[PDB]
Amino acid sequence: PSWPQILGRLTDNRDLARGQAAWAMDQIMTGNARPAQIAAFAVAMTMKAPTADEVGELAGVMLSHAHPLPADTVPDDAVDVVGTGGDGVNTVNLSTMAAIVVAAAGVPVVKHGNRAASSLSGGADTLEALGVRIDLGPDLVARSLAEVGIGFCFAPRFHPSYRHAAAVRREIGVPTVFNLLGPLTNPARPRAGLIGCAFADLAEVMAGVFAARRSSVLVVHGDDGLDELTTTTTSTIWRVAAGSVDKLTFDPAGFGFARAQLDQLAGGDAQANAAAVRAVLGGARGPVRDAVVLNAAGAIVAHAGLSSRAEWLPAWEEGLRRASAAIDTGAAEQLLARWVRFGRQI
Amino acid sequence: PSWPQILGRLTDNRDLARGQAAWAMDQIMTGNARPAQIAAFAVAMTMKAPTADEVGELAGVMLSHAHPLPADTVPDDAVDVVGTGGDGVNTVNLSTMAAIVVAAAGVPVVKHGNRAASSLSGGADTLEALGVRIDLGPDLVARSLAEVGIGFCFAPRFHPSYRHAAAVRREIGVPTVFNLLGPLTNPARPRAGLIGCAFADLAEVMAGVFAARRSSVLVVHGDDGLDELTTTTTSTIWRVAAGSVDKLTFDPAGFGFARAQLDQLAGGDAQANAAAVRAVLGGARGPVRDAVVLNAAGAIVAHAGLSSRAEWLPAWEEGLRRASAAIDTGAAEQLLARWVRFGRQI
Numbered sequence A, B: 001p002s003w004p005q006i007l008g009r010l011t012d013n014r015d016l017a018r019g020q021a022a023w024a025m026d027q028i029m030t031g032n033a034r035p036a037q038i039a040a041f042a043v044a045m046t047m048k049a050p051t052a053d054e055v056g057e058l059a060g061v062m063l064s065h066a067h068p069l070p071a072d073t074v075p076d077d078a079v080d081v082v083g084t085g086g087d088g089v090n091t092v093n094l095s096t097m098a099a100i101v102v103a104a105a106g107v108p109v110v111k112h113g114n115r116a117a118s119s120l121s122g123g124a125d126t127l128e129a130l131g132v133r134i135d136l137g138p139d140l141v142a143r144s145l146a147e148v149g150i151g152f153c154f155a156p157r158f159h160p161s162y163r164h165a166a167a168v169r170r171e172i173g174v175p176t177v178f179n180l181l182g183p184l185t186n187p188a189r190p191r192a193g194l195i196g197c198a199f200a201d202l203a204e205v206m207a208g209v210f211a212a213r214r215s216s217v218l219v220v221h222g223d224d225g226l227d228e229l230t231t232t233t234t235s236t237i238w239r240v241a242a243g244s245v246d247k248l249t250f251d252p253a254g255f256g257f258a259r260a261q262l263d264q265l266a267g268g269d270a271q272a273n274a275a276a277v278r279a280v281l282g283g284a285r286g287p288v289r290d291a292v293v294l295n296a297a298g299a300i301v302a303h304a305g306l307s308s309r310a311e312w313l314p315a316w317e318e319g320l321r322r323a324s325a326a327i328d329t330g331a332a333e334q335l336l337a338r339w340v341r342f343g344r345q346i
């Protein structure tokens, strides 16, 4: 294989042969690709329209190179809540808030995340401002998960060989297929997830990658453009269960949610977004809470799907009940406090 | 303007706004673009499908930055004979041989060229092997043109600010829109040419760029893949005259040319290809001579097109007669000897 061969095939608008995307990603991950080659590959793949097979190869290479968690430290039913980012709408950190609530409901959460790329504050930035340690290595993440019920895998700490690709992503500035890889490369490899996709025409490809792994996952795109389950309108959901993908339209009004305006979900810098986390966890009513509860419930539904006996509507009602109770009893607020203390106590 | 704006527009499969391609190329020509940005741009433009407006912007910027020839040193009727290269068929240097014969017939030739990229020996490599000075500056090319009837503009000598783009083209090694720019950026700006295009679906775009300049040009693509008029089969010609483009198919059998096999046109390293030039100019009959006479006649037809009185069949008959006579009288052989002497006597 070679760059001229692979890039030529993509510019001819042809799908790659089996193993070609993997070869490319591995060249990229070993410091063996020129920045120009990395860029051409990212752009060419994006414009051809990447297939699930191709994206799965990219993600697989990344997972091969990632720092893994220690054997037997990740519960079989661990869940992630994370999105591509890049929806362009500056919101509060919905996935991060949802993840805390989910953990507090008793679902183990190993969250993958990163700093902002185009937003004012990313999940990692907001966690840092809350006093949560985002610098933890494999062993300490495993301990966080066991002792607190949640662990945070900071993308740059677990994927050091992605350095070169990350740099090129920053330089070119446009979204590419690389923007899909974060949610697909959690180093703890959880089998369930609520996965947000900002790019409506690539969400089905992300869902195909999860289906290949037989994950129980909801890939979500709010019909307003959010990489989260939205409260402002319907959301498209690509449901992954039993190795197949199901596309459906989701309306939170069907569960009693009131239509919000995007303005109401608006965020700020790390300090502002941290304050919004404390506000929700302290029981504050309103649009932000509603959005947090809905997404927390979505992750609980994904967790439920790890069993083939899970039914859609009863799963959602249970998810909503559990998410609401985890906040209302103060369990979510206490969990955050316990998470902060854990990192301080080394 | 910005890289994210421009690259995003391209990845959304949209034509650029007027001036955006020019902004991009200017950034690239001023050393202000990262290699990743250069590559993303070249690739994204290629996969979107470039327009003549866009390619015309890129070439315009390059021509802005190029060393010009001194005022009033290029005859109004000078012609170029040059191709994109990249046909991936190792042939003798047909454009370069054609250019010598055309100059010997008395049509002023200011030829743009470069060393090999893909092939064993490019036009510049073969001229060097023949003893021709290939890297003369503006004043000396002007003198060569006046005194010998032909001048050669070496792309790296006249387009020094293209070095970063050139480097990226080499690194990524798949053709992009940049592969079109050589024949479109002759620094002497001759108004006529025989212009080869290896890429069947980009030839019409090249022709549109020349149309916008009101050049008299035949853009040619051999139906066997050659970026020259072939003798093995038909060629597609995009004829540019009076600011418009006419698509034609051309069959040299209509002018008495026997079919050749492509291996009959095969070349080798610069020494071999130099020997091939000497063989044709010394009156050797055979397939190489036929392909040379045909291409020289094409260039003479383009020159004739600078008049609105030019008629297609008479022009080809005159071109063929003039090209053959220039070889047979020994004028083409003598012009090469004189060109070699000129460079030695500077």
Ligand SMILES: O=P(O)(O)OC[C@H]1O[C@H](OP(=O)(O)OP(=O)(O)O)[C@H](O)[C@@H]1O
Pocket (backbone or CB within 6 Å): A081, A082, A083, A084, A085, A086, A087, A088, A092, A093, A094, A095, A096, A097, A112, A113, A114, A115, A116, A117, A118, A119, A120, A121, A122, A123, A124, A182, A196
């Ligand atoms: O700056 P952007 O490109 O828009 O990305 C915003 C955030 O979205 C992703 O994380 P995640 O879903 O985990 O964070 P969230 O809590 O902000 O939803 C990404 O890692 C960023 O942290």
Ligand SMILES: O=P(O)(O)OC[C@H]1O[C@H](OP(=O)(O)OP(=O)(O)O)[C@H](O)[C@@H]1O
Pocket (backbone or CB within 6 Å): B081, B082, B083, B084, B085, B086, B087, B088, B092, B093, B094, B095, B096, B097, B112, B113, B114, B115, B116, B117, B118, B119, B120, B121, B122, B123, B124, B182, B196, B228
């Ligand atoms: O290595 P490649 O990418 O295939 O390019 C082969 C040659 O074709 C172009 O020139 P030109 O048309 O002047 O050369 P020619 O005499 O070989 O036809 C290009 O400048 C190279 O010199």
Ligand SMILES: O=C(O)c1ccccc1O
Pocket (backbone or CB within 6 Å): A114, A155, A156, A157, A159, A160, A161, A162, A163, A166, A167
């Ligand atoms: O975004 C990443 O995952 C990353 C990884 C390694 C180095 C820098 C980075 O931004």
Ligand SMILES: O=C(O)c1ccccc1O
Pocket (backbone or CB within 6 Å): B114, B155, B156, B157, B159, B160, B161, B162, B163, B164, B166, B167
């Ligand atoms: O090929 C070119 O035009 C070129 C131009 C400047 C520097 C190096 C180069 O190869």
Ligand SMILES: [Mg+2]
Pocket (backbone or CB within 6 Å): A081, A082, A083, A085, A093, A094, A095, A096, A196, A227, A228
């Ligand atoms: Mg999110």
Ligand SMILES: [Mg+2]
Pocket (backbone or CB within 6 Å): A083, A085, A087, A091, A094, A095, A196, A226, A227, A228
């Ligand atoms: Mg989001």
Ligand SMILES: [Mg+2]
Pocket (backbone or CB within 6 Å): B082, B083, B085, B093, B094, B095, B096, B196, B227, B228
């Ligand atoms: Mg040529």
Ligand SMILES: [Mg+2]
Pocket (backbone or CB within 6 Å): B083, B085, B087, B091, B094, B095, B196, B226, B227, B228
């Ligand atoms: Mg050629």
